[PDB]
Amino acid sequence: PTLPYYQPIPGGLNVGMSVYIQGVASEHMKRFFVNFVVGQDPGSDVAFHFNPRFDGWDKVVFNTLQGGKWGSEERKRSMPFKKGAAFELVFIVLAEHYKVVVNGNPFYEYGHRLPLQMVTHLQVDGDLQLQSINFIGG
């Protein structure tokens, strides 16, 4: 797959589904994001924005974009990616939250703010190369 990636999630999200992304963080990475998006029209809401950042104290930001407004960020001040390194990034969709697992290590649980059933698309962009994106347990 090529970037930017913005593709429908076959069948939409359901509890029990996993999204499995294999990629390589750029040697020159500043940020990348994975968005679970409600639609494909301009101005679409983002149910879940997952955003690793190397600018400053390395961290991952988690948020929702609704009605053109970013919500209150959740943040984890740990960086599970490494510049130039391949990663395995998994989102397990559960009733209460998205469970994020990186390279086998549980990383975060982001509580649903928009109903998960409204998500139609996965969008990925930023400073990485993608090897694959797979939807499991749909």
Ligand X SMILES: O=S(=O)(O)O[C@H]1[C@@H](O)[C@@H](CO)O[C@@H](O[C@H]2[C@H](O)[C@@H](O)[C@H](O)O[C@@H]2CO)[C@@H]1O
Site for ligand X in 24-53 (CB under 6 A): 49, 51
For residue 7, what are its two tokens?
């593709």
Q: Is 96 in the site for ligand X (CB under 6 A)?
A: no
Instruction: Give CA–CA dist 63/46, Å, rounded.
Output: 8
Q: Least distance to ligand X from the beta carbon of 69, Å?
A: 9
Among 52, 63, 116, 119, binds ligand X (CB under 6 A): 63
Q: Is 73 in the site for ligand X (CB under 6 A)?
A: yes
Among the listed residues 60, 118, 64, 65, the one whose alpha carbon sits nearest the alpha carbon of residue 89:
60
Instruction: Give CA–CA dist 123/24, Å, rounded.
Output: 16
Residues near ligand X (CB under 6 A) are: 49, 51, 61, 63, 70, 73
